[PDB]
Amino acid sequence: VAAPSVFIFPPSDEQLKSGTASVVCLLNNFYPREAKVQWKVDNALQSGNSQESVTEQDSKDSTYSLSSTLTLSKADYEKHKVYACEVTHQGLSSPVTKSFNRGESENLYFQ
Numbered sequence: 001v002a003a004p005s006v007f008i009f010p011p012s013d014e015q016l017k018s019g020t021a022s023v024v025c026l027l028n029n030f031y032p033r034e035a036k037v038q039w040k041v042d043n044a045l046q047s048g049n050s051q052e053s054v055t056e057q058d059s060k061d062s063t064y065s066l067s068s069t070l071t072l073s074k075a076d077y078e079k080h081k082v083y084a085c086e087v088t089h090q091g092l093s094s095p096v097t098k099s100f101n102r103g104e105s106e107n108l109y110f111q
Contacts, residue, residue: 002031003031003094004035006037006086006095007025007026008023008025008084009083010102016077021074023077024067025067025085027065027067027087029063030087037087038085040082042106049076050070051069052068084100
């Protein structure tokens with residue numbers, strides 16, 4: 001098994017203004033067909049609040065790719081700030097942990 005790269009990004013500036021925050025994660029050509037990307041926000045896993053469709057393998061190189069759609073409420077995301085996504089499967093839990101803060105760093109006292 002070989003866990004590909006993982007990239008996560010917050011919803012559009014105006015997107016959140018709509019009254020709901022939606023996180024998106026880009027998955028790279030994975031090995032195992034059971035490649036599922038996990039959601040993580042401010043050290044909080046997002047289970048149930050995510051639903052995306054499967055993408056067909058390319059043709060130029062018969063490659064593979066998948067994307068996840070996270071659906072969160074405006075207030076829900078307001079409490080969070082960090083966004084990270086990692087791929088999971090029979091192989092390893094996660095190859096590389098990629099996260100980023102939207103409001104402030106996670107090295108301060110309680111708020």
